[PDB]
Design a protein around this motif. Sequence first.
Motif, short mmCIF file in Angstrom:
data_model
loop_
_atom_site.label_atom_id
_atom_site.label_comp_id
_atom_site.label_asym_id
_atom_site.label_seq_id
_atom_site.Cartn_x
_atom_site.Cartn_y
_atom_site.Cartn_z
N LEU A 1 94.78 99.05 0.04
CA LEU A 1 94.11 99.05 -1.10
C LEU A 1 94.81 99.95 -2.82
O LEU A 1 95.37 101.15 -2.13
N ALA B 1 94.82 103.63 -3.92
CA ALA B 1 94.18 104.24 -3.47
C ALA B 1 94.58 106.06 -2.64
O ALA B 1 95.73 106.40 -3.02
N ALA C 1 105.22 104.72 5.81
CA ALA C 1 104.64 104.81 6.81
C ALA C 1 105.17 103.03 6.92
O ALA C 1 106.02 103.24 8.36
N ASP D 1 96.00 100.67 10.46
CA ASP D 1 96.68 100.93 10.44
C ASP D 1 97.66 99.17 9.94
O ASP D 1 97.78 98.47 10.71
N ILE D 2 97.98 99.56 8.53
CA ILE D 2 99.07 98.14 8.08
C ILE D 2 100.42 98.14 8.86
O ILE D 2 100.86 96.99 9.41
N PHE E 1 93.56 102.70 5.81
CA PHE E 1 93.85 103.53 7.29
C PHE E 1 92.63 104.19 7.26
O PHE E 1 91.99 104.75 8.90
N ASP E 2 91.80 105.10 6.03
CA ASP E 2 90.86 106.19 6.42
C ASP E 2 89.92 105.79 7.27
O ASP E 2 89.23 104.26 6.61
O1 LIG Z 1 93.70 105.61 3.56
C1 LIG Z 1 93.49 104.01 3.29
O2 LIG Z 1 93.49 103.58 3.13
C2 LIG Z 1 94.33 104.88 1.95
C3 LIG Z 1 95.92 104.92 1.44
N1 LIG Z 1 96.68 104.57 2.42
C4 LIG Z 1 97.48 104.09 3.43
O3 LIG Z 1 98.40 105.47 3.44
C5 LIG Z 1 98.09 103.14 4.76
N2 LIG Z 1 97.30 102.14 4.28
C6 LIG Z 1 97.15 101.43 6.11
N3 LIG Z 1 97.64 101.16 6.70
C7 LIG Z 1 98.74 102.64 6.66
N4 LIG Z 1 99.80 102.52 7.65
C8 LIG Z 1 99.99 103.85 7.54
C9 LIG Z 1 99.01 104.85 6.56
C10 LIG Z 1 98.85 103.42 5.52
C11 LIG Z 1 96.84 104.64 0.64
C12 LIG Z 1 96.62 103.69 0.44
C13 LIG Z 1 97.70 103.11 -1.31
C14 LIG Z 1 98.91 104.31 -1.98
C15 LIG Z 1 98.76 105.78 -0.27
C16 LIG Z 1 98.35 105.88 0.41
F1 LIG Z 1 98.10 106.89 0.86
#
Ligand SMILES: O=C(O)C[C@@H](NC(=O)c1ncnc2[nH]ccc12)c1ccccc1F
Length: 167
Positions: A124, A127, A50, A20-21, A154-155
Motif C-alpha cells: 500500500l 502507508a 525488507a 509479508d510481501i 504487513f500490519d
Molecule cells: O503495514 C503495512 O502494510 C504498511 C507498510 N508495509 C510494509 O512495510 C510491508 N508491507 C508488506 N510486506 C512487508 N514486508 C516487510 C515490510 C512490509 C509500508 C508501506 C509503504 C511504505 C512504507 C511502509 F512501512
Amino acid sequence: VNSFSGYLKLTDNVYIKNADIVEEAKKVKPTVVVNAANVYLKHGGGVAGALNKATNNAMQVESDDYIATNGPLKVGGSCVLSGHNLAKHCLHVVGPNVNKGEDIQLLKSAYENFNQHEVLLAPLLSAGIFGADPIHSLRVCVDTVRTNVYLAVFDKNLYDKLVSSFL
Ligand SMILES: O=C(O)C[C@@H](NC(=O)c1ncnc2[nH]ccc12)c1ccccc1F
C-alpha cells in the motif's frame, strides 16, 4: 488464473491480503513486485528495507548503479529494475512521504505507474512509515489502478482496519 492465494477481492481488479510481501514474492515469483521506494533508491526500512534484505543487498547494489547513471527519480515516478530472487522485475515506485513534508496529492501519479503492468504484487503506497492516511491510499489505489493488483499489507491491525472501512 494466477497463484495468488487467500486474497480478499475488493474490486474487479484489486485484491488484498495480510501478508509479508517478501514471502508472497518468494512463493509466487510474480512478474512484477512493487517496491515503496524513495527518489534515491536508498532501501532502508519498511517495504524497501525488507525487499532489499531479502535480496542479500543485491537490490541496493543495482540501485546505486542506476542512480549513478540516471540520477534520482521524481516523487510520483518509477523505474523498472531486476526482481532478483523475488520476482522477474521490481517496479520501484516513489509515493509521497508525508514525514518528509511531501505533497500527498502526488499519490495518484505514483499509482498510475502500476497501469504499465498487467499484474503486480504491491504494498500500500505511502502507508506505514511514509506517513499518509492508509484508508486514503487504498481509495486512491482502487480509483487509479486498472490492471490487476495484489496488495500485501504487513500490519495485521492495519489490514483489519482497511477491510472494515473499505467502501
Ligand atoms: O503495514 C503495512 O502494510 C504498511 C507498510 N508495509 C510494509 O512495510 C510491508 N508491507 C508488506 N510486506 C512487508 N514486508 C516487510 C515490510 C512490509 C509500508 C508501506 C509503504 C511504505 C512504507 C511502509 F512501512
